[PDB]
Structure 1
Amino acid sequence: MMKKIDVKILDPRVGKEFPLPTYATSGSAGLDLRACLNDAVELAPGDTTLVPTGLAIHIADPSLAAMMLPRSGLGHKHGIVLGNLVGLINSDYQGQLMISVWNRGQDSFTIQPGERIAQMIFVPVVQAEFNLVEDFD
């Protein structure tokens, strides 16, 4: 299923020096997000840094959310994952998309400007209404 998502470019290098997020292939679940940075950021073991994307999206449909995830290679091989583990993006969020980058491993890592440092999937979400009961079936 396809959905057009409104995006506001906040940094003029996004779409230019830092390409807009893209699906690496046509069967790819996730779009790879790029670090919108002026200079490289050295992330020491155990440390977390907030990386700008230079963009804002507005999902708008409350039946939809996005989830930011590590990329497998960075996570597995380099211990470069998310400080919030999974980043949940609400349909009504219109701020800048930010990446909490966490070095969960033993080796210092250089986050380069423009690096595809995380990915994001769009998934349907269901809004629950609680029905109080004394017992289940």
Structure 2
Amino acid sequence: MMKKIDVKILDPRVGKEFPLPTYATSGSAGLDLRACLNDAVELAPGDTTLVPTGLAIHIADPSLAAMMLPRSGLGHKHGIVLGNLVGLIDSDYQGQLMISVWNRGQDSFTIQPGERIAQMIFVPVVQAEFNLVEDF
């Protein structure tokens, strides 16, 4: 199911030195996000670094949100995951998309400029209207 989402490019490397995000296939659930870096960042075991994407989105529809997830292989094989574990992007967030990258393993890992380092999915969300009860 498709939804138009505004995207703003913040760094001129985007598109020029690595591509914009695209779905691998029409059956893909997520979009891979790439590290927008002047220089490679070497992450020792246990450390966290904030990696820019050079991108901002504005979802705008309050019935939609995005969730940022680790990449499967990076996480399983290399211990490279997200420092906030899963990163929620609200419909009114219009700042740069930033990736909290955490090395949860025992091996150092260097993030190269342009490397795919997380994925993003778009999911419908609901806002609860709470009904206060004193017994269910």
Shorter-chain TM range is: over 0.9
Rounded Cα–Cα distance in structure 2 between residues aligned with 1:40 and 1:111: 6
Rounded Cα–Cα distance in structure 2 between residues aligned with 1:121 and 1:110: 25
Rounded Cα–Cα distance in structure 2 between residues aligned with 1:34 and 1:105: 21
Q: Does 2:84 align with 1:91?
A: no
Cα deviation per residue 1:15-39 (whole Å; 9 max; x = unaligned)?
2212111112221100000000011
Rounded Cα–Cα distance in structure 2 between residues aligned with 1:61 and 1:19: 26
Instruction: Compute the displacement of 1:55 (Å).
Output: 0.6
Q: Matched residue of 2:52: which SS?
A: strand
Rounded Cα–Cα distance in structure 2 between residues aligned with 1:53 and 1:11: 8
Cα deviation per residue 1:26-84 (whole Å; 9 max; x = unaligned)?
21100000000011000000000000000100000000000000010000000000000
Gap runs ≥5 in structure 2: none
Rounded Cα–Cα distance in structure 1 between residues aligned with 2:36 and 2:98: 10
Rounded Cα–Cα distance in structure 1 between residues aligned with 2:57 and 2:83: 21
How many residue pairs get aligned? The number is 136
Rounded Cα–Cα distance in structure 2 between residues aligned with 1:93 and 1:20: 19
Rounded Cα–Cα distance in structure 1 between residues aligned with 2:119 and 2:16: 19
Matches within 5 A, 1:54-133: 54-133=54-133
Instruction: Compute the displacement of 1:129 (Å).
Output: 0.9
Instruction: Compute the displacement of 1:135 (Å).
Output: 1.2
Cα deviation per residue 1:116-137 (whole Å; 9 max; x = unaligned)?
000000000001111000111x
Instruction: Compute the displacement of 1:108 (Å).
Output: 0.1
Gap runs ≥5 in structure 1: none
RMSD, aligned α-carbons: 0.6
Instruction: Return 19-28 or 91-100, whichever deviates more.
Output: 19-28
Instruction: Compute the displacement of 1:13 (Å).
Output: 1.0
Q: Runs of 4 or more off by more than 6 Å in structure 1?
A: none
Instruction: Compute the displacement of 1:8 (Å).
Output: 0.5
Rounded Cα–Cα distance in structure 2 between residues aligned with 1:39 and 1:17: 13
- State TM-score, norm by structure 1: 0.98
